[PDB]
Amino acid sequence: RDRRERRLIFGTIASKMSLAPEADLDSLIIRNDSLSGAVIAAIMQEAGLRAVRKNRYVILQSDLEEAYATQVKTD
């Protein structure tokens, strides 16, 4: 993934995904590099789930970082 892609990937899901102001894709544009758009799209709506899994109607960067840093290595 080149970052414009992520930038577009991120600018894809969080577009339709109720977010918490913490949620920062341009924070992730540095965080996220060299990954798979699906997983990236996953991390997007993984956070889409996690805040909902936390019953947060506002998906954080945490919720993202939850998704992200959990999925930076699923290991």
């Binding site: 936390k54 019953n55 947060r56 109607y57 506002v58």
Partner: protein, 293 residues
């Protein structure tokens, strides 16, 4: 102390930090209080996430009207600052009903008295149009009825009425700071100004093939532009038909006459006789024979 935000704030994180709702009843009150502070904060949103989580569970409670009402009142107050009146009264209506059970009719009427009032305060509602009669509504003591009578006034709506009805009703009626924050009644009146005008257009709508802007302004008791607005409104709302001709100062009311009509109209003209000749017929010979004689 006058601390509000931090006061809210130290309390703002409960739902999350604190209980997984190990005890809601405790928690929800803070949630409430947060919601309350959320008002002191002025942000429903705190309340919101709280709010839209909580109430069903009060419903899922061995349902606690207090926990309802309190919330429901917040829910009110939410909707108040919100000022979305269907929704306002919608909430109202909800535990309002619960407070037929809970309150008397009486003490609980003003809710209603405001509920439909809110419903009317709302530019309209469709459910409202169903909510129109309810049943014992015009709860059959207060009026409470001019309320529904206005709801009734709708079908005949005129808007010579407006300042009249304004003058006509404000014991609380137009005049409500009571459970609604019309500080002036504009938040009724103004809001209701169009509201009537709005609905007035509806019966106006039906009653017109064509009209002058004047006859509008005549009946509307409005300036052209106002009218034009209200025109353009439902024009831009599409909610009606019209003709804007200022050069005519005239509204053709816009019959959409290309339906080809005599497709069905004649088909109905057929249907007429299909009804008619057929309906009218089948009894005829049957008739004088059914009597015979």
């Amino acid at each position: 102390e006058g601390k509000i935000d931090e006061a809210a704030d130290i309390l703002c994180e409960l739902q999350v930090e604190t209980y997984g709702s190990m005890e809601m009843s405790e928690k929800i009150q803070f949630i409430l209080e947060q919601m309350e502070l959320s008002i002191l904060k002025g942000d429903y949103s705190q309340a919101t996430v709280l709010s839209r989580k909580i109430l069903k569970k009060t419903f899922k409670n061995p349902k606690y009207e207090s926990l309802k009402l309190e919330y429901y009142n917040l829910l009110v107050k939410i909707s108040l600052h919100k000022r979305e009146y269907l929704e306002v009264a919608q909430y109202l209506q909800e535990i309002y009903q619960t407070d037929a059970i809970k309150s008397d009719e009486a003490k609980w009427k003003p809710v209603l008295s405001h509920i439909v009032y809110f419903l009317v305060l709302s530019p309209y509602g469709n459910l409202q149009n169903d909510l129109i009669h309810k049943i014992q509504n015009d709860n059959n003591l207060k009026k409470l009825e001019s309320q529904e009578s206005l709801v009734k006034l709708f079908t005949t709506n005129e808007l010579m009425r407006w300042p009249i009805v304004q003058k006509t009703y404000e014991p609380v009626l137009n005049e409500d700071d009571l459970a609604f924050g019309g500080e002036a009644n504009k938040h009724h009146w103004e809001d209701l100004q169009k509201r009537v005008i709005e609905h007035n257009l509806r019966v106006i709508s039906e009653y017109y093939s064509r009209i002058t802007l004047l006859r509008l302004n005549e009946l509307l008791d409005l300036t052209e532009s106002q009218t034009e607005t209200y025109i353009s409104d439902l024009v831009n709302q599409g909610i009606i038909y019209a003709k804007v001709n200022r050069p005519a100062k005239i509204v053709n009311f816009e019959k959409p006459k290309n339906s080809s009509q005599l497709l069905n109209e004649w088909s109905h003209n057929v249907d007429e006789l299909l009804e008619h000749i057929e309906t009218i017929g089948h009894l005829i010979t049957k008739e004088e024979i059914m009597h015979g004689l």
